Design a protein around this ligand. Sequence first.
Ligand code: HEM
Ligand SMILES: O=C1C=CC(=O)N1c1ccc(O)cc1
Length: 153
Amino acid sequence: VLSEGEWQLVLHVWAKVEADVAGHGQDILIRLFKSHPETLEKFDRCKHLKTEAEMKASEDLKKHGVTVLTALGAILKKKGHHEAELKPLAQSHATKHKIPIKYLEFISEAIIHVLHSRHPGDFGADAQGAMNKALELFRKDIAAKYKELGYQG
Ligand code: HEM
Ligand SMILES: O=C1C=CC(=O)N1c1ccc(O)cc1
């Protein structure tokens, strides 16, 4: 469980992300695809992205990144009470997109990299620790739901 202070650090930095959801979403997905290129194979329209500049110019990539950050933001604002928000995400990610927990670890690392790149002054050790605990709780709860739906990935 997170402390109230740890939640407040997570939501403080999240309010910075919300100043430019699209740009943060682009940088997070570009970092994910650069660091772990196998992840580009999870959506057919993304095999066409061969350069960083094409990734930055893709309206499709930018809209995907806003959808990710919008859903994750709503989950983090529930401060752990996120069953109703997490269930549908687990359903689609386990049964349709087939995203393994290791790929949710990859995108978590990219989220931490971008938040520290853009907001170092508001993302020091305590804030990084709080965000890492919040993303750990997200991945733990989503994996339990994956298993309830019969997906062991
Ligand atoms: C913080 C983690 C993530 C969140 C909150 C998130 C959220 C979402 C949401 C809200 C959608 C649209 C609704 C849906 O189908 O569920 C979506 C679709 C999708 N996600 Fe994720 N996602 C996450 C991580 C990933 C990762 C790591 C991958 C691939 C490696 C991925 C692949 C997909 C695909 C292929 C779709 C459908 C895209 C489309 O049809 O245009 N997701 N995700
Ligand atoms: O799977 C792929 C390949 C490239 C791309 O943009 N995505 C994607 C990632 C996360 C997401 O939520 C939606 C789509």
